């Protein structure tokens, strides 16, 4: 018997990266790239940082109830802000996975 104790957002970031390219005028261009592997990347990150807040939160929760087992529910896919693409100015997307502490309850 699992009961949620807190669910909140983790969040991992993709940042934009310059790309260097001519338009078919010859004309060179400057673009702010985010691939749909950094989206992937950006997600692993926020999962990363939910088990890394559990990892803490864990050290307090066996002592408010000692007698319980505790886990990190992780979302199995992120919500983005945004999607893969090119920009003028650079920028980027969050990734933002729920991660909900739970505790066994007798």
């Known amino acids: 018997n699992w009961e ?29 790239v ?3 592997a950094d989206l992937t ?11 890394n807040v559990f990892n803490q939160i864990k050290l307090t929760l066996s002592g408010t109830w000692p007698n319980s087992q505790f886990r990190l529910v992780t979302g199995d896919t992120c919500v ?10 650079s920028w ?3 990734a933002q996975v729920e991660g909900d502490i739970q505790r066994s309850v007798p």
């Open 4 to 32: 949620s104790i807190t669910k909140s957002y983790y969040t991992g970031f993709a940042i934009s990266k310059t790309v260097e390219s001519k338009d078919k005028d010859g004309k060179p261009v400057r673009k702010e």
């Open 34 to 36: 985010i691939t749909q």
């Open 41 to 51: 990347t950006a997600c692993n990150d926020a999962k990363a940082s939910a088990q």
């Open 80 to 89: 983005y802000n945004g999607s893969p693409g090119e920009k003028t100015e």
């Open 92 to 94: 980027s997307i969050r």
